[PDB]
Design a protein around this ligand. Structure first.
Ligand code: B49
Ligand code: B49
Lengths: 285, 282
């Protein structure tokens, strides 16, 4: 990247979102006039810039239609600015909080595009680790995009010990919870999270959203633990109930991959296109 | 690193611990080393492992195992390091029983020196415990690695935290299941749990389910653990435990500040205390 003021190339506009992790702002390229998203990562004076730089190189090497495009980065006065593709409708959580439940075909389309993104991430030896409505972006043309590629499947692989992770517990696979008492998870943890995300788009929250997050992880490690299910049987077709059953299979040895899931009836059926989301975006008035 | 068989330079002697480690001897110098072996799959990315190795090459301190080189051969990645003859403190205490207070004080002083270094290099260990603290035949103390960068997933527009063993994790690491993050002071808490582990042979609440231990750390009225038998230990050891086990990371002292504590500043802390403990194995 460059050590320069990003205002040299962009007009900084409205705050789109943020958290403790950092902020994201709308902006416009001064030359082209195209809108972009600018991730702003705040640094402390003693933070190691080289580690941030290393992460950026992953954005420079990975490219896919269903992951937000990367345009460049600016390090300036303890702020790291990352230029990404703008997605006008924000996240699916921003959309379903206004619009209400998504239709079965809208969820089918979302899942297909997210599986295309996951199949790519996984082939590049990355694991997303937090697939959920808030981390799936939608543009004005109704196209689906992941906000990042995740990070390497091998974290601390050279260490003589294992490291587990905590993403958002309601979307975490059982074997990630079990790393607190056993060893190992792999890229299939993202397939379970996609199944919870389908329930989250159908119903307006994931299963057990009112239970404490560490109790949700605890219940997943007990024997006789039953994976979650759609609460209304009649409202959804057999194909959707099966997609939920196979994506939410308890054992990762029996859970299908992103490539295998792209052959499932729910996401292989005709009539899945960006137009179904353009209909969802029309419900904002 | 090299793309060649490590057996070109090393005589492999013994399997040590399962993520596989071998004791070996250098063919030219005759010096013993530990060789870590990582099995790779045909489609694994080589650069990701070699990026990790570089971190190993950049960091150097007496209280972390020395790195000697690496070898890639037929989908096996080998990392050559300093050999620590007595193994881990857990391998030692499972035979010898409880460590003495002076032995614990010397161990903590040495680990704090390693952590102060590790933290100045912007790393976090994330799993300080007896099994991850090595001892050599001379009774010197070494961490088995330098940890990983303090920032993992920093560029992501989301919170993602990487987690060690629940019984040794700080309350703010448990709170990550609800909101926010944590910092390097989580290793100071883990060292306080390790001191109780070396004194009692188990960390606090070892019979409670690991996720239940973490759940209790997020509740209102949570109270940190203490040493069980008050009269066996001096007030300096009780105070060391009290300050390292400060619930709030904002009030918990740094490794540098903990190095001025009476327990680890007292005279007579040297490798001889550990040579005594190693005599109990024989
Ligand atoms: C439907 C609109 N919403 C109300 C319901 C408004 C709230 N949501 C919004 O403003 C919003 C918009 C319009 N874009 C983003 C985020 C990103 C974007 O565009 N490219 C990225 C690339 C990476 C990244 F990590 C985030 C983004 C948000 C949160
Ligand atoms: C006497 C042996 N004991 C039986 C009671 C314990 C068994 N354990 C043993 O033998 C043992 C010994 C003698 N060294 C190690 C490991 C390491 C070593 O030396 N340098 C490293 C550097 C990095 C690392 F990740 C591991 C090691 C073990 C497990």
């Amino acid at each position: 990247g460059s050590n320069r003021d990003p205002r040299d190339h962009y007009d900084l506009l409205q705050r789109l979102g943020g958290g403790t992790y950092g902020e994201v702002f709308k902006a416009r390229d001064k030359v082209s006039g195209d809108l972009v998203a600018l991730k702003m990562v705040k640094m402390e004076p003693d933070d190691d810039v080289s580690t941030l730089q290393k992460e950026i190189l992953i954005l420079k090497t990975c490219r896919h239609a269903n992951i937000v495009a990367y345009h460049g980065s600016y390090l300036w006065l303890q702020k790291l600015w990352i230029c990404m593709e703008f997605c006008g409708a924000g996240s699916l959580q921003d959309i379903y909080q206004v619009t209400g439940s998504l239709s079965e075909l809208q969820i089918s389309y979302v899942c297909r595009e997210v599986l295309q993104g996951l199949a790519y991430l996984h082939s590049q030896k990355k694991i997303h680790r937090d697939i959920k409505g808030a981390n799936i972006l939608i543009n004005d043309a109704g196209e689906v995009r992941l906000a990042d590629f995740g990070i390497s499947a091998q974290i601390g692989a050279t260490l003589a010990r294992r490291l587990s992770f905590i993403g958002t517990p309601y979307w975490m696979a059982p074997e990630v919870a079990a790393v607190a008492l056993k060893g190992g998870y792999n890229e299939l943890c993202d397939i379970w999270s996609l199944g919870i995300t389908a329930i989250e788009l159908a119903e307006l929250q994931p299963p057990l959203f009112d239970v404490h997050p560490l109790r949700v992880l605890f219940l997943m490690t007990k024997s006789g633990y039953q994976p979650p299910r759609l609460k209304e049987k009649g409202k959804w077709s057999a194909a959707f109930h099966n997609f939920i059953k196979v994506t939410l299979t308890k054992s990762p040895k029996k859970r299908p991959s992103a490539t295998k899931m792209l052959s499932h009836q729910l996401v292989s059926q005709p009539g899945l296109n960006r137009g179904l989301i353009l209909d969802l975006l029309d419900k904002l008035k």
